[PDB]
A paper describes a structure:
Localized reconstruction provided the in situ structure of the P2 polymerase to sub-nanometer resolution. The application of the localized reconstruction method to the polymerase complexes of φ6 exemplifies how this limitation can be circumvented, allowing the structure of a viral polymerase to be determined in situ. This opens up new possibilities for studying RNA replication and transcription in the context of the assembled double-stranded RNA virus capsids.
Here, we present a general computational method termed ‘localized reconstruction' for solving structures of symmetry-mismatched parts of macromolecular complexes.
Author numbering: 1 to 664
The structure:
C-alpha cells in the first residue's frame, strides 16, 4: 500500500505555490463547487420545461432513432451509437460523492497485469526507438501561452505577466533548479524559482452517462461510476473501495428542494488536476515543435482536422480498426519514465531537466472538497515524491504519452499477431528508425491513425492482412487481451474524435464513411459542461464564448451526419413542444448576439464585418475554445482570435533555453 503522505491542507508548501492572495488562499481553502451552469445565458441547467424538452428529446427520438452499429462495432444505418438519454442528468449538478486518486496503480497494472517493461527486448528497442525519434530532430519556434489562463498551481494568478516571470526565470535557471532537485533541493527552486510543487484536483464533468431504458418497466440506468476512496487511493488500490457516487436528484429535491423529473441524475465528476507551468514551458517549447514535427515529418497518423483529413487516408484501407482504450491516464508505466529519462540522457537531454520531468511526472497532489465534508487533504511529499498517480492533467504533453504507448502497443500488437515475420525488417534500432519513419509515413500494410487514446488502424493487399483479420477477431471477442500495458478493446460503436466511421453492407473502410456526430451536437447544445460566469466585462475569462456560432455552423459542422436535417426537425419541433417557441430564432439571435459581443472584441475584422475571416473549424473553436485545451492543438486557430485567445512568447529565450535543454 504505502500511503502517499496525507499532509494537512495547511502547510507552508501549500502556501509556496499559491500567491497567498484572494484566489490563492481561497483555492487552498476551497469548498466543494456546485451550481447549475447557466447552460445558456439567461438559462441555467435547471429549467423544468426544458427538462421536459429533454424528456421528449431523448425519449421520442431514441425511440425514432435506434443506433446502427454492427456486431463488429463497425457502424451502419442512421449511424447512431448512443442513447440520447445521456442528456438526462443534472447537467449543472454533479453526481456526488467523488473518487480519491491513487499514488500507484502499479499493482493495478499488475491486475490488468500491465507489463513492467518490454515484452520482447526487441520491443524494448522499439520503445527506445519511438523515444529515439520523439527525441530527435528539432526546429525550435517561439513558445505561446493562453491569455487569461490562470497560473493555477502555483500562484493561481490570472495575469499573463506572472506566467511570464515564471517561465522566463525558468528559462534562466531551470538548469540550476533541476540540478537542485537532482541535489534534492526541491523546495529551494520551489520557493525561489517556485518550480514544480503540486497538483490541485479539479473536475472534468462527463456531460452524459450511459442511461439505459428498460423495455419491461422504463428504468433509466446511467452507467455506474465506480470510484476510489481515500484509502483505496493511498493504499495504491490496496485498501479502500470502489463505488458509485450518488446519482440521485431527489437528494437535491432533498437539499436544494429542486424538483426531480425522470431520468435526470447528475453529471459525472471526472477529476483533472492543475499544476506548475515553469516546467511546462520547456514542454510546449519542444513538444509543440515536435507536434509540428510529426505533423510535418509524418502527419498521416497524426494530422487532425477535417473528417476529410482522415477519411481520405482511410477509405484507402482494405481494413480499418478503431481502437478502444482503458483508463487512459492512470495506466502510464513508470518504467516507461525510466526508459524516457534513460534515452533522454543517452541522447544528451539535460539531466536537470530530466529531473524536472520526473519531478512533475511523480509530482505531489492535493484534494479539495470531493464531497462536502471531504478532502482538503494535501498529498505527497515534495521532498521525496514517489507518486505513480498516472497521467496528471497538468501536463499538456501527456497527449504525447498517450499517443505514444497507444501507437506502440497498437503497432506492436500488429507485429504480435499480424506481422511477426515482418519484424525481420526490424533488425535493430536503426531499422526501427527507417521503419518508424516509414510507418508514420505509412508506407506499410499494417496501419493506424492516432491521437492520445483515440485511434484507428488500417490494412491492404500484401502478405500480412489475414492475421489482421485474426487479431481483429480476437480483440472483437475481447475474451483475452494480448496487450500487457493496456486493456485495449475494440470500441463497439467506435469513432475517432467524433468522426464516426460508417460502413455499408460491404462493411469496408472504402465503404461508408465518417460523420460528425449529431448526438454530440446535441451535447454541444445541452450536455457540454461549463457555465460562462456572465458577470464579467470580458468573455475571455468565460468558459464558453459563443454557442450561437455552432448553431449556424451546424450543417457545416455535424451536417456530416446524413440524417442531420431530421435532427433539425426534431429540435425545433421539440422546442415548440417545450417553450413553445422558435429555438430557431432563439439561437439565431444568440448567434447574432455572439457577433455583437465579439464585434467589439475584434478590431481587424472591422466592425461587424462578418465571420468570413474564421474557418468553420475555427468557428468550432469559437463556439468551443475549450476543447483546444484537450482536443485542438494551439496552432489550429486562425491567428486573429488565436491571439485573442493566446499570447506570444519570445522565440529567443526559449531558443537558447532549448539549446541548453536539447543535447545542444
Ligand atoms: Mn471520434
Amino acid at each position: 500500500p504505502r500511503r502517499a503522505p496525507a499532509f494537512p491542507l495547511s502547510d507552508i508548501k501549500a502556501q509556496m505555490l499559491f500567491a497567498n492572495n484572494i484566489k490563492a488562499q481561497q483555492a487552498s481553502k476551497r469548498s466543494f463547487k456546485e451550481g447549475a451552469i447557466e447552460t445558456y445565458e439567461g438559462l441555467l441547467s435547471v429549467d423544468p420545461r426544458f427538462l421536459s424538452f429533454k424528456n421528449e428529446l431523448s425519449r421520442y427520438l431514441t425511440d425514432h432513432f435506434p443506433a446502427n452499429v454492427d456486431e463488429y462495432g463497425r457502424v451502419y444505418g442512421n449511424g447512431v451509437r448512443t442513447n440520447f438519454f445521456g442528456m438526462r442528468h443534472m447537467n449543472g449538478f454533479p453526481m456526488i460523492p467523488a473518487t480519491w486518486p491513487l499514488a500507484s496503480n502499479l499493482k493495478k497494472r499488475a491486475d490488468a497485469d500491465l507489463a513492467d517493461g518490454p515484452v520482447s527486448e526487441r520491443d524494448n528497442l522499439l520503445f527506445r526507438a519511438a523515444v529515439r525519434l520523439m527525441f530527435s530532430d528539432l526546429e525550435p519556434v517561439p513558445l505561446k501561452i493562453r491569455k487569461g489562463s490562470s497560473t493555477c498551481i502555483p500562484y493561481f494568478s490570472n495575469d499573463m505577466g506572472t506566467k511570464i516571470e515564471i517561465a522566463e526565470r525558468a528559462l534562466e535557471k531551470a538548469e540550476e533548479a533541476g540540478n537542485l532537485m537532482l541535489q534534492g533541493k526541491f523546495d529551494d527552486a520551489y520557493q525561489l524559482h517556485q518550480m514544480g510543487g503540486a497538483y490541485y484536483v479539479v473536475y472534468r464533468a462527463q456531460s452524459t452517462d450511459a442511461i439505459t431504458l428498460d423495455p419491461k418497466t422504463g428504468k433509466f440506468v446511467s452507467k455506474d461510476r465506480m470510484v476510489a476512496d481515500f484509502e483505496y487511493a493511498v493504499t495504491g488500490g490496496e485498501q479502500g473501495s470502489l463505488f458509485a457516487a450518488s446519482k440521485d436528484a431527489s437528494r437535491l429535491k432533498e437539499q436544494y428542494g429542486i424538483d426531480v423529473p425522470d431520468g435526470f441524475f447528475c453529471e459525472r465528476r471526472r477529476t483533472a488536476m492543475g499544476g506548475p507551468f515553469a516546467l511546462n514551458a520547456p514542454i510546449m517549447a519542444v513538444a509543440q515543435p515536435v507536434r509540428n514535427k510529426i505533423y510535418s515529418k509524418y502527419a498521416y497518423t497524426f494530422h487532425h482536422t477535417t473528417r476529410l483529413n482522415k477519411e481520405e487516408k482511410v477509405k484507402e484501407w482494405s481494413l480499418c480498426v478503431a481502437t478502444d482504450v482503458s483508463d487512459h491516464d492512470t495506466f502510464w508505466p513508470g518504467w516507461l519514465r525510466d526508459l524516457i529519462c534513460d534515452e533522454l540522457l543517452n541522447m544528451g537531454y539535460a539531466p536537470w531537466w530530466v529531473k524536472l520531468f520526473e519531478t512533475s511526472l511523480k509530482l505531489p497532489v492535493y484534494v479539495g472538497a470531493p464531497a462536502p465534508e471531504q478532502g482538503h487533504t494535501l498529498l505527497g511529499d515534495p521532498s521525496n515524491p514517489d507518486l505513480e498517480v498516472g497521467l496528471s492533467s497538468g501536463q499538456g504533453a501527456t497527449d504525447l504519452m498517450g499517443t505514444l504507448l497507444m501507437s506502440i502497443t497498437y503497432l506492436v500488437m500488429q507485429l504480435d499477431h499480424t506481422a511477426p515475420h515482418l519484424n525481420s525488417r526490424i533488425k535493430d534500432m536503426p531499422s526501427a528508425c527507417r521503419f518508424l519513419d516509414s510507418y508514420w509515413q505509412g508506407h506499410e500494410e499494417i496501419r493506424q491513425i492516432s491521437k492520445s487514446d483515440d485511434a484507428m488502424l488500417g490494412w491492404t493487399k500484401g502478405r500480412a492482412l489475414v492475421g489482421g483479420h485474426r487479431l481483429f477477431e480476437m480483440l472483437k471477442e475481447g475474451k483475452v487481451n494480448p496487450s500487457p500495458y493496456m486493456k485495449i478493446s475494440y470500441e463497439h460503436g467506435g469513432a475517432f474524435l467524433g468522426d464516426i466511421l460508417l460502413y455499408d453492407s460491404r462493411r469496408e473502410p472504402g465503404s461508408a464513411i465518417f460523420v460528425g456526430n449529431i448526438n454530440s451536437m446535441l451535447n454541444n447544445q445541452f450536455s457540454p459542461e461549463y457555465g460562462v460566469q456572465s458577470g464579467v466585462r470580458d468573455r475571455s475569462k468565460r468558459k464558453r464564448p459563443f454557442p450561437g456560432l455552432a448553431w449556424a455552423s451546424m450543417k457545416d459542422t455535424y451536417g456530416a451526419c446524413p440524417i442531420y436535417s431530421d435532427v433539425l426537425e426534431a429540435i425545433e419541433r421539440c422546442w415548440w413542444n417545450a417553450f413553445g417557441e422558435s429555438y430557431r430564432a432563439y439561437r439565431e439571435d444568440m448567434l447574432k448576439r455572439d457577433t455583437l459581443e465579439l464585434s467589439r472584441y475584434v478590431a481587424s475584422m472591422a466592425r461587424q464585418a462578418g465571420l468570413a475571416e474564421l474557418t468553420p473549424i475555427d468557428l468550432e473553436v469559437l463556439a468551443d475554445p475549450n476543447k483546444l485545451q484537450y482536443k485542438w492543438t494551439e496552432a489550429d486557430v486562425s491567428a486573429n482570435i488565436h491571439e485573442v485567445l493566446m499570447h506570444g512568447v519570445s522565440v529567443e529565450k526559449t531558443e537558447r533555453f532549448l539549446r541548453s535543454v536539447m543535447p545542444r
